[PDB]
Structures are given as structure tokens and as C-alpha cells.
Amino acid sequence: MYTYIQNFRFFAGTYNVNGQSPKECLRLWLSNGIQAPDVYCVGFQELDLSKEAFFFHDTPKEEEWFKAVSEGLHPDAKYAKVKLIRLVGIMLLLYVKQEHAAYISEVEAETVGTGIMGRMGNKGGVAIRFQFHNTSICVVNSHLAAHIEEYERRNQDYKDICSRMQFCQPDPSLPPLTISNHDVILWLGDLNYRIEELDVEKVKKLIEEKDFQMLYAYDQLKIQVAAKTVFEGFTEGELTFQPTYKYDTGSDDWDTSEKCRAPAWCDRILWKGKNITQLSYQSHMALKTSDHKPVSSVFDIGVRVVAHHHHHH
Ligand SMILES: O=P(O)(O)Oc1cc(-c2cc(OP(=O)(O)O)c(OP(=O)(O)O)c(OP(=O)(O)O)c2)cc(OP(=O)(O)O)c1OP(=O)(O)O
Ligand SMILES: [Cl-]
């Protein structure tokens, strides 16, 4: 046989749905005029805020949002469900075009709670890793700790995900698979890093003026990554969309409750590995089901394809 690099189109999405059932068609998120992706990696947070889901019960929110997403994928291609994984309200879905189904192997999913008592599932991460052709890929969906002052807990949450997430090994004599041990890592979710120092009315005003350079200079994720305390070697595209948190339900108004929570770029998509090229990075204002807005991104990722020759002598 022989081998070559081929670009396939990866969509990555993250959406914190605030414990709500889907009430809106998700084509605006998943298939907004773009070309049909080869792979869909769709992640959720706060799927179900009930006591029941928190204590590991099954939730109808799962099937509800799965169908919502299935129906939302690009109508020009037939998509195969590869894998679903959920811890409490953190759910990751992996689809691929039916063409590619035969070349997906070694699918493993795992979860890690980092919430109450540092081990429950109100916060944490879930991951699906797999081999597409001869490229190892791991997709991680995490919901890190809330609130401005808890940036150091968000750091630790990231650490625990990174050290506890262990995938199964076809060869038992080798060390278990960790997230790092992959050709391609996409990390998405409500990473929940807020705006430091600046006060609430400053932020909104700075957002109203669309100066996303000055606001970004005080973004906690940037800061911490700069201090090399989290996400070493990861990259993120330029943020050309306004903060994706926190809104009033059913509108584009900033949280008007008594908490009057400041805006933030809670919901992010980061990556690491070779031959990854980000084509877009967008939020989707139209969808008003949640107090967050959903965020998408499309990559051209170069996969190592091993194939058969045609008669060529
Ligand atoms: O790359 P891999 O390792 O697979 O090896 C090869 C397979 C075929 C091949 C094998 C077939 O089936 P079978 O071998 O019977 O399983 C085919 O179906 P067919 O028998 O229906 O004709 C075929 O026809 P298409 O071109 O794919 O239609 C091509 C040709 C190759 O080039 P060449 O012929 O120039 O040597 C070749 O490279 P190599 O030179 O390295 O051997
Ligand atoms: Cl499944």
C-alpha cells in the first residue's frame, strides 16, 4: 500500500444550554451556509441541572439534544453516529460522513468529574478519542468552575482532567492513553474563564464599542495561558464575536437578574497537533434558548491516509 496526507473538514461546537430542553432548530449553529463537514464534534454543558442527573440518573435531555443535533447537521450528506458520552450535563457527540465510517477505529470515551468535593459531575470533562485513517484524534469537552475569582480552580480542574482521563490500551504492556498522546487534540467547552479587574459597566461599554482587543487583554484564559499555568501548546483563533455569556433567556440582553453577572468569553475552542488549519470561529446570536450562545469552528485537518494503489504499471 502507500500513504499520503489528505485534508478532511472538521466542525467543532460547544453549547451551554442552561438545563433547558431544545426549543430551536440547530441548523443555524451546525450548518449555517457552510459546506458539509466530514466530521462533527458537538459538545454540551448543563444538559440537565436536576438533582437526579447530578446523582448519575439517566436524563431525557440526552435523547432530546441528540435528535436536535442530528436534525441540525448539514442536509447534503448522510451522517453516522460514532459515539456519545455524557457525565451529568457534559455531553460530547461524534458524527462522521457515512463515506468515512469504515476508516474510524479504536473509539474510546471517558469522563472526569471535578465539581463538588472535587469529584462530582456538575463540572468536569468528557472525551472521545479515535483513529481516523492513520491519525489519532482526541476531542475533549470540559465545563470548568464558575465565577471570576475561581481562575485557580479552573486551572486545577484542567490539571485533573489531564491527569485522570485515561483511555483503554489495545496493547496492555504500554502506558495508558492520555489526552496528550494523540496526533490531534481539539479541546472545547465552557472553560468559564472571565474578564479580570475591569468592572461590569466597563465591560459592556467596551463590548458595545466592539474593541475586542482591549477586552481580550484582560481575559483570564489568555492571562493564565501566558503564565503557562494551563493549556500548554494549545492555540486559539482570534475572537471576532462578542462575549457568549451571560444573557437573559429568550433574548440578546445582558443578564438582568439581581446577580447582574458580567459578560465573558466562557465558551471557547482550542487545539493542538500538526496540519490543523482553522477556517472559522463564530458565535451564533440567533439562538436564544440559553443564557449562553453557542460557538462553532471549522478546521481543515490533514489526516495520514494509507490506501491501495490502482494498476499503474
Ligand atoms: O497498494 P496495494 O498494496 O493494494 O497493492 C496494489 C494493488 C493493486 C490492485 C489490486 C487489486 O485487487 P487484488 O490485487 O486482486 O486484490 C485491484 O482490483 P482488480 O483485481 O479487480 O483489478 C486493482 O484494480 P483497480 O485499479 O483498483 O481497479 C489494483 C494495484 C497495484 O499497482 P500495480 O498493479 O501497478 O502493481 C498495487 O501496487 P503494488 O505495485 O505495490 O503491488
Ligand atoms: Cl454511543
Domain ranges of the chain: 1-313
CA-wise closest residue to 90 among 132, 25, 43, 130 = 43
Single-letter amino acid, residue 199: D
Query: Could you tell me the resolution of this structure in angstroms?
Result: 2.9
CA 154 to chain centre: 16
236 to 121, 140, 204, 231, 281: CA distances (angstroms): 26, 15, 23, 10, 9
The span from the CA of 265 to the CA of 272, in Å, is: 20
306 touches ligand 1 (CB under 6 Å):
no
User: For residue 20, what are the contacts with CB-CB under 8 A and spacing of at least 6?
Assistant: 249, 289, 290
CB 269 within 8 A of CB 295: yes
> What are the helix (H) ranges across the chain?
27-30, 51-54, 60-72, 151-164, 200-208, 212-216, 220-226
Paired strand residues for 96: 39, 80
**Distance (Å) from CA 307 to ligand 1 centroid:** 11
Write out the binding residues for substrate: 46, 122-123, 245-246, 259-261
Ligand 1, from 3, 305, 309, 312: best to mutate by most atoms within 8 Å of Cβ?
309
**Distance (Å) from CA 46 to ligand 1 centroid:** 51
310 touches ligand 1 (CB under 6 Å):
yes
- Say which CATH topology domain 1-313 has: Deoxyribonuclease I; Chain A (3.60.10)
51 touches ligand 1 (CB under 6 Å):
no
Helix (H, G, I), strand (E, B) or coil at 93: strand
1 touches ligand 1 (CB under 6 Å):
yes
Write out the binding residues for Mg(2+): 18, 46
**Distance (Å) from CA 305 to ligand 2 centroid:** 25
**Distance (Å) from CA 22 to ligand 2 centroid:** 20
228 touches ligand 1 (CB under 6 Å):
no
CB 28 within 8 A of CB 286: yes
Looking up cell 503564565 gives: 227
List the determination method: X-ray
CB 214 within 8 A of CB 187: no
Q: Whose CA is nearest to atom 4 of ligand 1?
A: 308
Ligand 1, from 3, 4, 310: best to mutate by most atoms within 8 Å of Cβ?
310
Output the CA torsion sign for 247, 210, 198, 204. Answer: negative
CB 121 within 8 A of CB 146: no
The span from the CA of 36 to the CA of 17, in Å, is: 24
Q: Report the 10 Å Cβ neighbour count for 104.
A: 18
313 touches ligand 1 (CB under 6 Å):
yes
Atom of ligand 1 nearest to the CA of 310: 26
CB 289 within 8 A of CB 23: yes
CA-wise closest residue to 115 among 170, 55, 59 = 55
Looking up cell 451546525 gives: 30
Q: Whose CA is nearest to atom 33 of ligand 1?
A: 311
CA 301 to chain centre: 16
The 8-class DSSP code of residue 32 comes to S
308 touches ligand 1 (CB under 6 Å):
yes
Residues 162/154/202/260 CA torsion (nearest 10 deg) = 130
217 to 144, 148, 189, 254: CA distances (angstroms): 21, 15, 21, 21
**Distance (Å) from CA 132 to ligand 1 centroid:** 23
User: For residue 65, what are the contacts with CB-CB under 8 A and spacing of at least 6?
Assistant: 17, 21, 22, 44, 47, 91
The span from the CA of 106 to the CA of 137, in Å, is: 10
Longest dimension (CA), the chain: 76
3 touches ligand 1 (CB under 6 Å):
no
CA-wise closest residue to 12 among 30, 35, 36, 34 = 30
Vertex 189 angle, CA 194 and 35, to 5°: 120
Beta strands in the chain (DSSP E): 2-16, 39-45, 79-87, 90-97, 104-113, 124-132, 135-143, 184-190, 267-273, 276-283, 295-307
Helix (H, G, I), strand (E, B) or coil at 264: strand
